[PDB]
Amino acid sequence: MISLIAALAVDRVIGMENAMPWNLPADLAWFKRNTLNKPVIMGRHTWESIGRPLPGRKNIILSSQPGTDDRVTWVKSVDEAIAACGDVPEIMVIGGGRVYEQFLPKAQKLYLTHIDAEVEGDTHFPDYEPDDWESVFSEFHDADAQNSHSYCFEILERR
Ligand SMILES: NC(=O)c1ccc[n+]([C@@H]2O[C@H](COP(=O)([O-])OP(=O)(O)OC[C@H]3O[C@@H](n4cnc5c(N)ncnc54)[C@H](OP(=O)(O)O)[C@@H]3O)[C@@H](O)[C@H]2O)c1
Ligand SMILES: Nc1nc(=O)c2nc(CNc3ccc(C(=O)N[C@@H](CCC(=O)O)C(=O)O)cc3)cnc2[nH]1
């Protein structure tokens, strides 16, 4: 079972040239609890964004090019990424856009944070045909002194 986890602003924006213009420590906490002790598949750009391996997660990095960090596992295809996660209850695909697009059709679950932020971005979460997905969990939060925007955690399971 493959799951995607992603934080989307409006128009499904997940990435832009520069850092996201927001501060959303609850979504980071959500990301950590939903990925904890699970293999994480990411693209090389996301790997570079994160800086270091996510602790206590098997980290699997897609690149067409040889790896450049022996702390993590490097694979050259989607199927190699999955195989590299081994035999686990849940693989988390943590992005970015190229990676999500390739994994969404394979995924049984989505963990999406919907952030009420107006951002122009070059990278977007894939369209998930909502007839293919059932929302099983939805939890809205206003912005607050720690979180710059309102946001909603959603879990969807593939029909
Ligand atoms: N011209 C464009 O508009 C364009 C197109 C694509 C990306 N970008 C830029 O990249 C940034 C973020 O991109 P993102 O979030 O899409 O990155 P991402 O998915 O985290 O990382 C993408 C990288 O992951 C690797 N990858 C993904 N799928 C793979 C596969 N099946 N096999 C082998 N390697 C695979 C490739 O690394 P290697 O690069 O090492 O092969 C690829 O370049 C954005 O700022 C965006 O503008 C721009
Ligand atoms: N809900 C959600 N929120 C996100 O911020 C998110 N980010 C990505 C990809 N980018 C990143 C960037 C940094 C870290 C990261 O370093 N997380 C730490 C928390 C500590 C910190 O921010 O320095 C972690 O251990 O999980 C993770 C993913 C993928 N899915 C997401 N999904």
UniProtKB/Swiss-Prot annotation:
InterPro entries: DHFR, DHFR-like_dom_sf, DHFR_CS, DHFR_dom. Residues 1-158 form the DHFR domain. The keyword Oxidoreductase applies. Changing M16N: Increases catalytic rate about 2-fold. Increases catalytic rate about 7-fold. Pfam families: DHFR_1 (PF00186). Substrate binds at I5, D27, R52, R57, T113. Changing M42Y: Increases catalytic rate almost 2-fold. Increases catalytic rate about 7-fold. Changing M16 to F/S: Increases catalytic rate about 2-fold. The keyword NADP applies. Changing M20 to I/V: Increases catalytic rate 2-fold. It catalyses: (6S)-5,6,7,8-tetrahydrofolate + NADP(+) = 7,8-dihydrofolate + NADPH + H(+). Its EC number is 1.5.1.3. GO terms for biological process: 10-formyltetrahydrofolate biosynthetic process; dihydrofolate metabolic process; folic acid biosynthetic process; folic acid metabolic process; one-carbon metabolic process; response to antibiotic; response to methotrexate; response to xenobiotic stimulus. GO terms for cellular component: cytosol. Key enzyme in folate metabolism. Catalyzes an essential reaction for de novo glycine and purine synthesis, and for DNA precursor synthesis. The strain K12 sequence is shown. Belongs to the dihydrofolate reductase family. This is Dihydrofolate reductase.
